[PDB]
Design an enzyme around this catalytic site. Structure first.
Site, PDB file in Angstrom:
ATOM      1  N   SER A   1       0.839  -1.191   0.000  1.00 59.36           N
ATOM      2  CA  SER A   1       0.000   0.000   0.000  1.00 59.36           C
ATOM      3  C   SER A   1       0.878   1.246   0.000  1.00 59.36           C
ATOM      4  O   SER A   1       1.729   1.412   0.881  1.00 59.36           O
ATOM      5  CB  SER A   1      -0.929  -0.007   1.210  1.00 59.36           C
TER       6      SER A   1
ATOM      7  N   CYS B   1      -8.025  -0.969   7.133  1.00 57.20           N
ATOM      8  CA  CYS B   1      -6.883  -1.494   6.397  1.00 57.20           C
ATOM      9  C   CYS B   1      -5.952  -2.253   7.330  1.00 57.20           C
ATOM     10  O   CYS B   1      -5.907  -1.991   8.535  1.00 57.20           O
ATOM     11  CB  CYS B   1      -6.113  -0.368   5.695  1.00 57.20           C
TER      12      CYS B   1
ATOM     13  N   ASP C   1      -9.267  -2.553   2.651  1.00 57.93           N
ATOM     14  CA  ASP C   1      -8.048  -2.911   1.924  1.00 57.93           C
ATOM     15  C   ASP C   1      -7.232  -3.831   2.835  1.00 57.93           C
ATOM     16  O   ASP C   1      -6.239  -3.424   3.441  1.00 57.93           O
ATOM     17  CB  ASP C   1      -7.253  -1.678   1.500  1.00 57.93           C
TER      18      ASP C   1
ATOM     19  N   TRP D   1      -5.211  -7.673   3.481  1.00 56.99           N
ATOM     20  CA  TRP D   1      -4.330  -8.581   2.755  1.00 56.99           C
ATOM     21  C   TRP D   1      -3.823  -9.639   3.731  1.00 56.99           C
ATOM     22  O   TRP D   1      -4.363  -9.806   4.829  1.00 56.99           O
ATOM     23  CB  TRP D   1      -3.184  -7.815   2.084  1.00 56.99           C
TER      24      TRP D   1
HETATM   25  C1  LIG Z   1      -2.984  -5.089  -1.860  1.00 57.24           C
HETATM   26  C2  LIG Z   1      -1.878  -5.673  -0.977  1.00 57.24           C
HETATM   27  C3  LIG Z   1      -1.295  -4.656  -0.221  1.00 57.24           C
HETATM   28  C4  LIG Z   1      -0.254  -4.955   0.667  1.00 57.24           C
HETATM   29  N1  LIG Z   1       0.375  -3.873   1.481  1.00 57.24           N
HETATM   30  C5  LIG Z   1       1.458  -4.190   2.399  1.00 57.24           C
HETATM   31  C6  LIG Z   1       2.100  -3.094   3.225  1.00 57.24           C
HETATM   32  O1  LIG Z   1       1.721  -1.976   3.124  1.00 57.24           O
HETATM   33  N2  LIG Z   1       3.183  -3.422   4.146  1.00 57.24           N
HETATM   34  C7  LIG Z   1       3.653  -4.834   4.266  1.00 57.24           C
HETATM   35  O2  LIG Z   1       4.531  -5.115   5.009  1.00 57.24           O
HETATM   36  N3  LIG Z   1       3.012  -5.890   3.448  1.00 57.24           N
HETATM   37  C8  LIG Z   1       1.925  -5.560   2.526  1.00 57.24           C
HETATM   38  N4  LIG Z   1       1.311  -6.611   1.733  1.00 57.24           N
HETATM   39  C9  LIG Z   1       1.781  -7.997   1.854  1.00 57.24           C
HETATM   40  C10 LIG Z   1       3.034  -8.170   0.974  1.00 57.24           C
HETATM   41  O3  LIG Z   1       2.656  -8.208  -0.362  1.00 57.24           O
HETATM   42  C11 LIG Z   1       3.750  -9.474   1.333  1.00 57.24           C
HETATM   43  O4  LIG Z   1       2.798 -10.461   1.585  1.00 57.24           O
HETATM   44  C12 LIG Z   1       4.630  -9.268   2.573  1.00 57.24           C
HETATM   45  O5  LIG Z   1       5.252  -8.022   2.514  1.00 57.24           O
HETATM   46  C13 LIG Z   1       5.705 -10.359   2.623  1.00 57.24           C
HETATM   47  O6  LIG Z   1       6.287 -10.497   1.342  1.00 57.24           O
HETATM   48  P1  LIG Z   1       7.675 -11.401   1.193  1.00 57.24           P
HETATM   49  O7  LIG Z   1       7.958 -11.638  -0.271  1.00 57.24           O
HETATM   50  O8  LIG Z   1       8.840 -10.678   1.825  1.00 57.24           O
HETATM   51  O9  LIG Z   1       7.477 -12.863   1.945  1.00 57.24           O
HETATM   52  P2  LIG Z   1       7.221 -14.272   1.114  1.00 57.24           P
HETATM   53  O10 LIG Z   1       8.484 -14.662   0.383  1.00 57.24           O
HETATM   54  O11 LIG Z   1       6.104 -14.075   0.110  1.00 57.24           O
HETATM   55  O12 LIG Z   1       6.789 -15.456   2.194  1.00 57.24           O
HETATM   56  C14 LIG Z   1       5.693 -15.197   3.044  1.00 57.24           C
HETATM   57  C15 LIG Z   1       5.196 -16.532   3.670  1.00 57.24           C
HETATM   58  O13 LIG Z   1       5.980 -16.901   4.646  1.00 57.24           O
HETATM   59  C16 LIG Z   1       5.044 -17.642   5.744  1.00 57.24           C
HETATM   60  N5  LIG Z   1       5.335 -17.137   7.065  1.00 57.24           N
HETATM   61  C17 LIG Z   1       5.447 -15.853   7.414  1.00 57.24           C
HETATM   62  N6  LIG Z   1       5.724 -15.806   8.723  1.00 57.24           N
HETATM   63  C18 LIG Z   1       5.782 -17.065   9.182  1.00 57.24           C
HETATM   64  C19 LIG Z   1       6.030 -17.584  10.436  1.00 57.24           C
HETATM   65  N7  LIG Z   1       6.325 -17.124  11.779  1.00 57.24           N
HETATM   66  N8  LIG Z   1       6.031 -18.895  10.624  1.00 57.24           N
HETATM   67  C20 LIG Z   1       5.789 -19.730   9.585  1.00 57.24           C
HETATM   68  N9  LIG Z   1       5.545 -19.224   8.352  1.00 57.24           N
HETATM   69  C21 LIG Z   1       5.544 -17.890   8.158  1.00 57.24           C
HETATM   70  C22 LIG Z   1       3.797 -17.406   5.434  1.00 57.24           C
HETATM   71  O14 LIG Z   1       3.168 -18.651   4.894  1.00 57.24           O
HETATM   72  C23 LIG Z   1       3.829 -16.322   4.338  1.00 57.24           C
HETATM   73  O15 LIG Z   1       2.835 -16.523   3.439  1.00 57.24           O
HETATM   74  C24 LIG Z   1       0.198  -6.282   0.791  1.00 57.24           C
HETATM   75  C25 LIG Z   1      -0.386  -7.296   0.031  1.00 57.24           C
HETATM   76  C26 LIG Z   1      -1.425  -6.995  -0.851  1.00 57.24           C
HETATM   77  C27 LIG Z   1      -2.093  -8.075  -1.701  1.00 57.24           C
END
Ligand SMILES: Cc1cc2nc3c(=O)[nH]c(=O)nc-3n(C[C@H](O)[C@H](O)[C@H](O)COP(=O)(O)OP(=O)(O)OC[C@H]3O[C@@H](n4cnc5c(N)ncnc54)[C@H](O)[C@@H]3O)c2cc1C
Ligand code: HEM
Ligand SMILES: Cc1cc2nc3c(=O)[nH]c(=O)nc-3n(C[C@H](O)[C@H](O)[C@H](O)COP(=O)(O)O)c2cc1C
Length: 814
Positions: free
Chosen positions: A600, A766, A811, A813
């Site tokens: 966001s 949100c 909003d 997620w």
């Molecule tokens: C419209 C939209 C808006 C968003 N806005 C924001 C924002 O403003 N700020 C923000 O930080 N994120 C936001 N997100 C979420 C963001 O897109 C990611 O999901 C998040 O930032 C993590 O991405 P990553 O690639 O670093 O982790 P990834 O590589 O994608 O891996 C995440 C996965 O790790 C697993 N996991 C996480 N923690 C643990 C745990 N303790 N134990 C076991 N498993 C775990 C989970 O299964 C999780 O799904 C938004 C998502 C959407 C769809």
């Protein structure tokens, strides 16, 4: 009613029914549209939308229409010109007809736009809101009935690429309509003009209709097949899925066919176990109030009152549905729960395809994990034919090899607008500081410079980012697998008539594919374990990989506990199973693509036009498999120190109210404060521009005041300047009982009700917080029920109506 949106919906009640019951529109609904009538309606619509958008451009700054100016999202003249070029040839400019009813509609549009702009809204409502409702189904009906390319040619009028959620956008549009200030007589004139527009469309439709004047068991025995996939479809999606499913059979060592269940007495399911290793699949769409597709009615009724013994029958069901309906996948669920009641046994779990989200992705996942389950259930472990052929380019120039870009060759170096999902812009990281004050988690505030990218955005929009995997992971995978990562190669799809010629941009190296094109981080799926079972030397680990491919039995317990719950990535699997020595090209073929991650936008384009601010929490945890896992996007962004980031901007429907006097009630625990910052910024800006700004209430939530209080200093400065009216922060870890934003909303119930009822405020919710949206929703239910005297049902209806008028925006997620 009193609000313009509800009055327009109520006034046009009868004319909408009459329009959708016109003979042409009825025939359209039933798939009987024909090419000539479609060319006619499309040319008429070209003329109509040309006139409408002409008058819109003429009055785009008149206060009686100004709040409804959405050219980037709604306008249709360009797509209609594309469709005219398609349907009428290169010289369509002089070949398209101009019928008298079309001229009547255009004349009325010009009269309104020229002398009575206060009525122009009534026409936009009649067209655009209609295009964002039934249109999405009509396009499908158009695609199948006329056999157009799946690329969308000829139906560009039915595609809105800048609207990712038509429901939320219709809510925003109703909100923009209700902002129009007008006397009640003008409101009645506007509703009557909407009736007039509906009548014009009705008589256009009428004029355009005035210008038109053997048992499958023995069948499989003589054809030598063991798989049959019945499709229950109405607009062709389940048919396509069943055909692709039967197509994989020939390319999996088996042999299948996709058949229509209408002209087959399914009593021949008792004769089906008389075929060696026979299994039947059902791709069932559900319509109505949980009713079957017409082509499957005879099927459905047959399962009502029957007792045919189906012992020894193998079946699998995939359902096509939509979560918005309250009979979600009734037909697929019914077929699944009923085939086992008659004696058959399930081979793979029932799939629940959602059409609200990505139905294609759900079906691809289901198929991908379905085929290994079948091969492991029947025991026909012959190892299937590949799908991509490896071609090594041992001598090749570097200017011809993909180096990590997403779109065209050297698109990361030759950056030219426009920038979107297929051509992201490489923004320079200007800032990357720490917002978290403690050490529980790392929460960061990034800033991306988009100076000359010509990228526009608004507060509430989203920014997507293409990350890169940790290079240590790539090097370790290349080590343990024993291959050279810098080998320039390509993978070519030998499914000659499948224009998906590569799994990722090619030619490229294995290192580049592992870093930028592949995931290598999320728990692997069933299909990759099944296709890797043939590369395990020890029979224990090979048998483990085989058993984990079974959805039924203690293999799933092994798959869910050791892979999913333990969060083992591909490197962890290759480590804990040292027998696995597969090639690297097959691995790059089996692994899913690396997805972009959304955030966001935490800034206002009116104060930061050349920068996009991101507020993100870094993902880093200790997995149950001992290893410490890191989030791809968050770790990749954390390493960025002022350093380019490929990003693009996706439009959302989260928008501040058009009138600056309208108060806002923002609720965002944790990272959900991200967009509201921008809001506050813009709000502060509107105060500095000398405009009258309503109340701005923020409801933020965190753990401790000294741990993860995001933007404490900036919010304090905003509050003392008067920009942020109230700073209501809930600290969940500072005493015995926890305090959340729900409690702070419950506290300010009276002032909140005076803002909602008398001030016409907008509510925003949100963040990531689980089960928070429903809690805030019930809190608002209770507030509305209490102060403005209402039954609980009246209050929930009030809040749902606020959501319809675009005053309660979400909003959330994960
Ligand atoms: C419209 C939209 C808006 C968003 N806005 C924001 C924002 O403003 N700020 C923000 O930080 N994120 C936001 N997100 C979420 C963001 O897109 C990611 O999901 C998040 O930032 C993590 O991405 P990553 O690639 O670093 O982790 P990834 O590589 O994608 O891996 C995440 C996965 O790790 C697993 N996991 C996480 N923690 C643990 C745990 N303790 N134990 C076991 N498993 C775990 C989970 O299964 C999780 O799904 C938004 C998502 C959407 C769809
Ligand atoms: C194929 C025939 C049609 C069907 C089945 C159909 C169906 C629907 C449905 C179900 C809705 C409600 C969606 C929602 O509330 O979010 C809707 C909304 C709407 N339709 Fe259509 N429609 C058809 C044709 C038309 C036509 C020809 C027009 C006018 C040109 C039109 C104008 C509208 C408008 C203005 C709305 C919004 C009503 C409101 O929420 O205020 N529709 N339509
Ligand atoms: C009139 C209509 C009614 C629908 N009703 C339901 C429903 O009740 N439950 C559901 O899950 N999906 C429902 N859907 C969603 C469809 O199942 C979904 O669009 C599916 O992909 C259609 O597949 P098809 O293109 O093969 O016909 C409905 C769709 C339409 C057009």
């Amino acid at each position: 009613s009193q609000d313009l949106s509800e009055a327009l919906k109520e006034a046009t009640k009868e004319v909408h029914i009459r329009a959708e019951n016109s003979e042409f529109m009825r025939n359209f609904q039933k798939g009987q549209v024909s090419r000539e009538g479609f060319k006619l309606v499309m040319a008429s619509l070209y003329h109509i939308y040309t006139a409408l958008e002409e008058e819109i451009e003429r009055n785009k700054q008149n206060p009686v229409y100004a709040p409804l100016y959405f050219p980037e999202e709604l306008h249709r003249r360009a797509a209609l010109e594309q469709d005219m070029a398609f349907w009428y040839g290169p010289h369509w400019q002089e070949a398209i007809p101009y019928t008298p009813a079309t001229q009547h509609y255009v004349k009325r549009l010009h009269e309104v736009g020229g002398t009575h702009p206060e009525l122009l809204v009534a026409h936009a409502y009649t067209r655009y809101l209609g295009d964002l409702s039934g249109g999405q189904v009509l396009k499908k009906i158009a695609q199948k009935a006329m056999a157009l390319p799946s690329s969308g040619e000829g139906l560009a009028f039915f595609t809105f690429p800048s609207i990712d959620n038509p429901t939320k956008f219709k809510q925003l549009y109703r909100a923009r309509m209700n902002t129009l200030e007008m006397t009640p007589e003008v409101k009645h004139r506007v509703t009557e003009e909407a009736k007039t527009a509906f009548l014009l469309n009705i008589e256009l439709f009428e004029e355009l209709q005035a210008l038109l004047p053997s048992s499958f068991v023995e069948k499989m025995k003589k054809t030598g097949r063991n798989i049959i996939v019945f499709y229950g479809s109405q607009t062709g999606t389940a048919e396509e899925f069943a055909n692709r499913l039967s197509k994989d059979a020939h390319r999996y060592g088996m042999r299948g066919m996709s058949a229509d269940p209408e002209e087959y007495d399914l009593a021949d399911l008792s004769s089906l176990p008389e075929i060696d290793k026979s299994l039947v699949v059902f791709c069932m769409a559900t319509y109505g109030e949980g009713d079957p597709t017409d082509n499957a009615q005879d099927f459905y009724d047959w399962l009502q009152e029957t007792d045919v013994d189906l012992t020894g029958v193998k079946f699998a069901v995939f359902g096509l549905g939509n979560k918005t309906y309250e009979h979600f996948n009734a037909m697929g669920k019914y077929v699944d729960q009923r085939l086992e009641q008659l004696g058959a046994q399930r081979i793979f779990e029932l799939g629940l395809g959602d059409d609200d989200g990505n139905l294609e992705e759900d079906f691809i996942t289901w198929r991908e994990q379905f085929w290994p389950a079948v091969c492991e259930f029947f025991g026909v472990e012959a190892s299937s034919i590949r799908q991509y052929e490896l071609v090594v380019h041992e001598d090749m120039d570097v200017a011809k090899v993909y180096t990590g870009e997403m779109g065209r060759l050297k698109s990361y170096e030759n950056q030219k607008p426009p920038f979107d999902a297929k051509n992201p812009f490489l923004a320079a990281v200007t800032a990357n500081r720490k917002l978290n004050q403690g050490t529980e988690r790392h929460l960061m505030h990034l800033e991306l410079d988009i100076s000359d990218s010509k990228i526009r955005y608004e507060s509430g929009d989203h920014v997507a980012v293409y990350p890169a995997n940790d290079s240590a992971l790539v090097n370790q995978i290349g080590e343990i697998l024993g291959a050279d990562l810098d080998v320039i190669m390509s993978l070519n799809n030998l499914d000659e008539e499948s224009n998906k010629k590569h799994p990722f941009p090619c030619p490229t190296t294995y290192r580049t594919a592992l870093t930028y094109y592949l995931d290598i981080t999320n728990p692997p799926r069933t299909n990759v374990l099944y296709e890797l079972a043939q590369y395990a030397s020890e029979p224990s680990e090979q048998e483990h990989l085989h058993k984990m491919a079974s959805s039924s039995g203690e293999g799933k317990e092994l798959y869910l506990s050791w892979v999913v719950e333990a969060r083992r990535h591909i490197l962890a699997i290759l480590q804990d199973y040292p027998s696995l020595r597969p090639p690297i090209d097959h691995l790059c073929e089996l692994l899913p693509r690396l997805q972009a991650r959304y955030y966001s936008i935490a800034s206002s384009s009116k104060v930061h036009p050349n920068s996009v601010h991101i507020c993100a929490v870094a993902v880093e945890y200790e997995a149950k498999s001992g290893r410490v896992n890191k989030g791809v996007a968050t770790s990749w962004l954390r390493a960025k120190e002022p350093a380019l980031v490929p990003m693009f901007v996706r439009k959302s429907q989260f928008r501040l109210p058009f009138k600056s006097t309208t108060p806002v009630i923002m609720v965002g625990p944790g990272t959900g404060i991200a967009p509201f910052m921008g809001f506050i910024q813009e709000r502060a800006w509107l105060r500095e521009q000398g405009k009258e700004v309503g109340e701005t209430l923020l409801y933020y939530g965190c753990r401790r005041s000294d741990e993860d209080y995001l933007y404490r200093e900036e919010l304090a400065r905003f509050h003392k300047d008067g920009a942020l009216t109230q700073l209501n922060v809930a600290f969940s870890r500072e005493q015995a009982h926890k305090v959340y934003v729900q409690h702070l909303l419950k506290r300010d119930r009276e002032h909140l009700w005076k803002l909602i009822h008398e001030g016409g405020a907008h509510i925003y919710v949100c963040g990531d917080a689980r089960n928070m949206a429903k809690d805030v929703q019930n809190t608002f239910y209770d507030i509305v029920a209490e102060f403005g005297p209402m039954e609980h049902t009246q209050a929930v209806d009030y809040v749902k109506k606020l959501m319809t008028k675009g005053r309660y925006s979400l909003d959330v997620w994960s």
